[model samples]
Target: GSHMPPNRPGITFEIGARLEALDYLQKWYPSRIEKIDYEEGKMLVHFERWSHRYDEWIYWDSNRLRPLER
Candidate 1:
């Protein structure tokens, strides 16, 4: 049987995925997906230990976002 392949090997962005996001200081911070815009390929991230007002919208393919390291 034929199998479909993903366009890219990357995180599958979801509305509640726990991940890490890069900050302006060039550091990765604990974050969670607050919302996502599939058509736009962007997601709203809420950084842990940060204020909700600081939640940011970042592109899904951006280097700013990555899987949480153990």
Candidate 2:
């Protein structure tokens, strides 16, 4: 789903799903899901145009992770 479904506390974004993630600077950047840790409710994401060293593991429900705003 493009948007989080109602009644779902967290998202189950598939691998390679493109989205936006907030950076330490509080700016959202384009990203893609590289891996998912369902048990931990976190996903490893690779920021677009960034180095792998900047890849992050973010929680599903974190405000830092969000859909790409239209």
Every model: Cα RMSD to truth: 5.4, 5.4
Query: Which has the greatest lDDT?
Result: 2
**For residues 1-70, could you state the per-residue lDDT of candidate 1 as single tens digits?**
3223224334555677788899878888989999877667678999999999989988776879877755
Tell how far residue 36 is off in model 2, in angstroms: 0.3
Itemize residue pairs with steric clashes in candidate 2. Answer: none
Report lDDT (CA) for all predictions.
0.77, 0.78
Question: Which candidate's TM-score is highest?
Answer: 2
**Per-residue lDDT tens digits of candidate 2, residues 1-70?**
1334233233347789888889877888999999887677778989999999999998777878777655
Off by over 4 Å in 2: 1-12
